[PDB]
Amino acid sequence: IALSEIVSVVNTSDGRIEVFGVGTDNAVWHNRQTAPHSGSSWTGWISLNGKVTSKPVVYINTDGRLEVFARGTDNALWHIWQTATNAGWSNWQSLGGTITSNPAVYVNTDGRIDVFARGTDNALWHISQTAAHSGPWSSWQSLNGVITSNPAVHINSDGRLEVFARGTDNALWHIWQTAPDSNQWSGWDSLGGVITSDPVVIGTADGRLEVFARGSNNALYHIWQTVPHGGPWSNWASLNGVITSAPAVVKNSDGRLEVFARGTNNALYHIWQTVSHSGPWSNWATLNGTITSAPTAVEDADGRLEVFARGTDNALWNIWQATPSWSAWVSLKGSLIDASAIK
Amino acid sequence: IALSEIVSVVNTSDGRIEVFGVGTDNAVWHNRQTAPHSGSSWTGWISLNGKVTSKPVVYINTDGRLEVFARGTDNALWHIWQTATNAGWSNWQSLGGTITSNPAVYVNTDGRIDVFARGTDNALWHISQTAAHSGPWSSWQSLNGVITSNPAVHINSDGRLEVFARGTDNALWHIWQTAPDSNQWSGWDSLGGVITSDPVVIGTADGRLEVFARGSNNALYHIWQTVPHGGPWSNWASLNGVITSAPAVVKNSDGRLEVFARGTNNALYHIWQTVSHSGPWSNWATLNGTITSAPTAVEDADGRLEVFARGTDNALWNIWQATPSWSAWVSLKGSLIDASAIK
Ligand SMILES: CO[C@@H]1O[C@@H](C)[C@@H](O)[C@@H](O)[C@@H]1O
Ligand SMILES: CO[C@@H]1O[C@@H](C)[C@@H](O)[C@@H](O)[C@@H]1O
Ligand SMILES: CO[C@@H]1O[C@@H](C)[C@@H](O)[C@@H](O)[C@@H]1O
Ligand SMILES: CO[C@@H]1O[C@@H](C)[C@@H](O)[C@@H](O)[C@@H]1O
Ligand SMILES: CO[C@@H]1O[C@@H](C)[C@@H](O)[C@@H](O)[C@@H]1O
Ligand SMILES: CO[C@@H]1O[C@@H](C)[C@@H](O)[C@@H](O)[C@@H]1O
Ligand SMILES: CO[C@@H]1O[C@@H](C)[C@@H](O)[C@@H](O)[C@@H]1O
């Protein structure tokens, strides 16, 4: 697997970016913008404690409360959650299980967080809240398959969760709810190709899933639903380049997709749709830096992309999107590790 | 009450704007962009039939299905829904009650649509889906108060619904859920002022409610939460102008608020936050035309504002936020009436 993202990031319900990563102590730490604008100062790193053995994944409940999922030292899924929106945190609590990947997390149309992770059998498993933004949690449940990457999940424009992963043949595979909120899932299906990164999935401005992944020649590839929330999918297409990390995809404030990834000189590169969403793609361009993780990208409250990546000093660095050139690479300090359960 | 909005507008799950209005036959008609882009052509007007006696209000269920609420000729609340996302429509069905205002509609954090309408006692009443995006519906319940305008609803950044309506003293009042999804609401709180239009409410880029209304001198006023999802509120602040309709507010793609209203010469006027969201407001500027309703504004899938208003020929007209100085007005044809239950 190509080098992973090292933080999970969200724009919170009060328009501040909040970033979560794993320290050299194997605890989860978070850092938050003090103001809801590009170029804001940062709180600085605060520990949520714990001892984790995967990438932490943050998700926002439908009531705005942040919730973090990660594998623990006992290999169970653990979580920790804000007890009120943007306020204080609970203690860490186990959700049991024994998992062998990073979690992937999404919310159902009924407000129930659904968490996906690989099992000891190498199947995809899932567990979910039984009520909107609320425990108790369900029991684990298998979705079978046998997968060789961390999973990625997104919602279709008809409300059906759909999960993506690399299979034993190194192809992109997927599986989907048969109906919104449903514990009844489809059978596994294959989209072919050969991929050398975790896949990353996004919903387009016109309601279609689009999936990006590094290919066997280390170029960036993508593939998409041809109609909203349905098949057929397209043929694989190449966006070229050569990337030395997992790709990260985000939607600009005007709908245009943009993808970020480490280049072969360890600098950050990006490529974007031009003209409009679903428009033709640009040439790759550099944003400089020397980075030691995959980048992570998010839209801030001013409608600008912000990217995060670990530096040569093992600190987290940040850069954001401005008219002619981007911002400075700015250090948020800290000392992060790649705790990804599959590397 | 100042002259109302004539259509209800929504972004569909496949990135097209869809507008809903009442025809000269008192049936609900709709028109949809053919393409998810600014300046797209339109399907043309299609009837949903029925016979309504309020402004119709569309809302998108969390599974992507559109649903329209309107008062019927029997003064009850009626609704009609898509049977599949962006597909065919149900028959009209009654939710009963007797209502004396336009409905206001919002979704709870648990995916259950809540509908609010003034009752025969001039209290605010509500009815909701009992499950996520699904019937059956609840019994009617009173949220008390005595109100003299149409209600407006939005969700807080902590997931609590909040409703605004003018009171018997002509002040802006409000009530809120004590917790997300709850049927337990607060008492009516006065935010004072004297308002001469329905209030409009929006959520800011940093998670605060902000309310706009015409005041006693026909100026535009606004008031806001000073902290995300909490009090205290600011004082009322004038945005000046002299407006001859209800105002409509929308958020740009970069978070800046922009308000639209009819001026004294019956043209469309607007005013916007400059620099960034929550920044200082512009001067009023005209967008020309001659309109016979309040405008309705929405962001399209390219991140551009689109405004709709009835024209002198009773057709619906459109203008959108093109680079230099906005598009030309284009007619979408049709023949619309103002069916608002309170005028
Ligand atoms: C809070 O508890 C600590 O962190 C959790 C995430 C688990 O790894 C547990 O075994 C460890 O003791
Ligand atoms: C269902 O098929 C099994 O699981 C898929 C996810 C792939 O790994 C495939 O090659 C494997 O045999
Ligand atoms: C712009 O700065 C460059 O890239 C950062 C991400 C850091 O690795 C730093 O040490 C390096 O000089
Ligand atoms: C389909 O039913 C028609 O429209 C409804 C919205 C009601 O006004 C009803 O009385 C009328 O007959
Ligand atoms: C269900 O209750 C009925 O409808 C409500 C909306 C109110 O108008 C009430 O006075 C009336 O009795
Ligand atoms: C709760 O109090 C009732 O409702 C408010 C909205 C006001 O109209 C007030 O005059 C009335 O007595
Ligand atoms: C731009 O055109 C002007 O405004 C439109 C909204 C229509 O009312 C039209 O008749 C009028 O002349």
Residues 6+ apart with CB under 8 A from B200: B152, B211, B212, B213, B246, B247, B248, B249
B7-337 falls under which CATH superfamily?
Answer: Fucose-specific lectin (2.120.10.70)
Q: Which ligand is nearest to the CA of B192?
A: 6
Separation in Å, CA B36 to CA A26, A242, B16, B49, B229: 45, 32, 5, 26, 33
Identify the DSSP state of A82: B
Calpha distance A339→A221 (Å, rounded): 26
Half-sphere exposure of A40 (CA within 13 A, CB side): 21
Calpha distance B48→B79 (Å, rounded): 11
| d(CA B254, nearest CA chain A) in Å | 4
Chain B residues with a Cβ under 8 Å from any Cβ in chain A? 12-16, 36-37, 61-64, 84-86, 108-111, 131-133, 157-159, 180-181, 204-208, 228-229, 252-255, 276-277, 301-304
Contacts of A301 in chain B (CB under 8 A): 205-206, 255, 277
CB contact under 8 A, A254 and B15: no
Please give all residues whose beta carbon lies within 6 A of any atom in ligand 4, as ranges.
B 50-52, 72-74, 78, 92
Q: How is chain A split into domains, by residue range?
A: 7-337
Q: Residue A95 CA to chain centroid, in angstroms?
A: 21
Calpha distance A16→B29 (Å, rounded): 40
CB contact under 8 A, A228 and B63: no
**3-state DSSP call for residue B313?**
coil
Residue of chain B minimizing CA distance to A209: B14
Confirm if A200 and A222 have CB atoms less than 8 A apart: no
Closest ligand 2 atom to Cα of A124: 6
CB contact under 8 A, B85 and A228: yes
Residue A96 token pair: 């049991």
CB contact under 8 A, A158 and B254: no
| d(CA B216, nearest CA chain A) in Å | 33
Separation in Å, CA B66 to CA B8, B86, B163: 12, 7, 22
Q: Which of B229, B214, B204 is nearest to B172 (CA)?
A: B214
Residue of chain B minimizing CA distance to A113: B110
Calpha distance A104→A271 (Å, rounded): 25
Calpha distance A200→A183 (Å, rounded): 23
> Do you find a cis peptide bond into A232, omega within 30 degrees of 0?
yes
Compute and round to an integer the Cα radius of gyration of chain B. Answer: 19
Q: Which of A98, A105, A12 is nearest to A63 (CA)?
A: A12
Residues 6+ apart with CB under 8 A from A220: A212, A213, A214, A238, A239, A240, A241, A243, A247, A259, A261, A271
Q: Which ligand is nearest to the CA of B54?
A: 4
Calpha distance A146→A143 (Å, rounded): 10
10 Å CB burial of residue A323 (0-12, 13-18, 19+) is exposed
Residues 6+ apart with CB under 8 A from A248: A5, A200, A259, A260, A261, A294, A295, A296, A297, A307
Residues 6+ apart with CB under 8 A from B230: none
Calpha distance B196→A283 (Å, rounded): 54
10 Å CB burial of residue B27 (0-12, 13-18, 19+) is middle
Other C-beta atoms within 10 Å of A113: how many? 23
Calpha distance A185→B211 (Å, rounded): 43
Indicate if the alpha-carbon torsion angle B23, B29, B34, B35 is positive or negative.
positive
Residue B40 token pair: 């797209």
Other C-beta atoms within 10 Å of B217: how many? 11
Mutation site for A-interface testing, chosen from B66, B254, B274 by largest number of A Cβ within 10 Å: B254
> Do you find a cis peptide bond into A136, omega within 30 degrees of 0?
yes
CB contact under 8 A, A301 and B205: yes
The protein residue with its alpha carbon nearest to ligand 5, atom 10, reads B120
Other C-beta atoms within 10 Å of A325: how many? 9
Ligand 7, pocket-test mutation among B265, B269, B290, most atoms within 8 A of CB:
B290
Q: Which ligand is nearest to the CA of A145?
A: 2
10 Å CB burial of residue A334 (0-12, 13-18, 19+) is buried
Confirm if A106 and A95 have CB atoms less than 8 A apart: no
The minimal CB distance from A301 to the residues B12, B108, B206 is found for B206
CA of B90 to the centre of ligand 4 (A): 13
Ligand 2, pocket-test mutation among A188, A191, A198, most atoms within 8 A of CB:
A188
Task: State the alpha helices, DSSP H only, in chain A.
Answer: none
Other C-beta atoms within 10 Å of B343: how many? 10
Residue A244 token pair: 């030395």
Confirm if A86 and B208 have CB atoms less than 8 A apart: no
Contacts of A277 in chain B (CB under 8 A): 15, 36, 301-302
Identify the DSSP state of B5: B
DSSP string covering A239-281: EE---SB--EEEE-TTS-EEEEEE-TTS-EEEEEB-SSTT--B
Calpha distance B302→A254 (Å, rounded): 5
> Do you find a cis peptide bond into B136, omega within 30 degrees of 0?
yes
Residue of chain B minimizing CA distance to A16: B206
Calpha distance A70→B56 (Å, rounded): 46
Q: For residue A154, what are the β-bridge partners?
A: A162
Residues 6+ apart with CB under 8 A from A20: A7, A8, A9, A28, A29, A30, A48, A56, A58, A68
**3-state DSSP call for residue B317?**
strand
Q: Which of B211, B175, B215, B212 is nearest to B194 (CA)?
A: B215
Residue A123 is which amino acid? A
Confirm if B28 and B334 have CB atoms less than 8 A apart: no
Calpha distance A135→A297 (Å, rounded): 30
The minimal CB distance from B157 to the residues A14, A206, A303 is found for A14
Residue with tokens 């990563």: A21
Alpha carbon distance, N-terminus to C-terminus of chain A: 5
Calpha distance B79→B81 (Å, rounded): 7
Confirm if B297 and B287 have CB atoms less than 8 A apart: no
